[PDB]
Amino acid sequence: RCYFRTSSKYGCISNRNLYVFGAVWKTEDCYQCKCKMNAMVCCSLVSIPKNYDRVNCVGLFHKKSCSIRVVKKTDPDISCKVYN
Template sequence: MQKALLCRLMVWSTFVTLCNAQCYFMPNMYTPGDLSNECKDLDGVTHPLSSKWKTENCEECSCGQDGISCCNIAAIPMNYDTIKCQKIFNKETCSYTVVEQKDPGKTCFVSGWAI
């Protein structure tokens, strides 16, 4: 039983390390007696309880009873030749490409990505 628990803990900790998600939480600001079924984001836009949306900053957010949770959805290139290559972010597709600095038409090999 302990071996199985230890094994699960090791797998979980490895998964958490690899994911490295960039998330944050904004608690709802309630006044006493307020039973609101919505969340208000930083831009002042209200969202229904249990709804999900994507922001223009490539974050996926959700409205819960306690507030808004948001996480980055763009995978960031981590292991590539930073001297020879550069990363370019496409905000419309929420994705990066890694290309040669001297010849942007050529892509570079990336061995690791983080979210």
């Protein structure tokens, strides 16, 4: 999901920081933001796995990839089938 905040004349001001128009960056909470002429747009990078066997599988969150990988509880090296 995405969030918006109107941009300034010189760029996107986000808490004491100024981002130039065209800047793209990832936040500490796994959002990707872009400073556009109209506003700053930040969208969540973490997709929530929708349909899987939550009895024998568990989602593993990886901070660097901003992802949830569904793996077997008995063997986290084996990924589980996830339906869209």
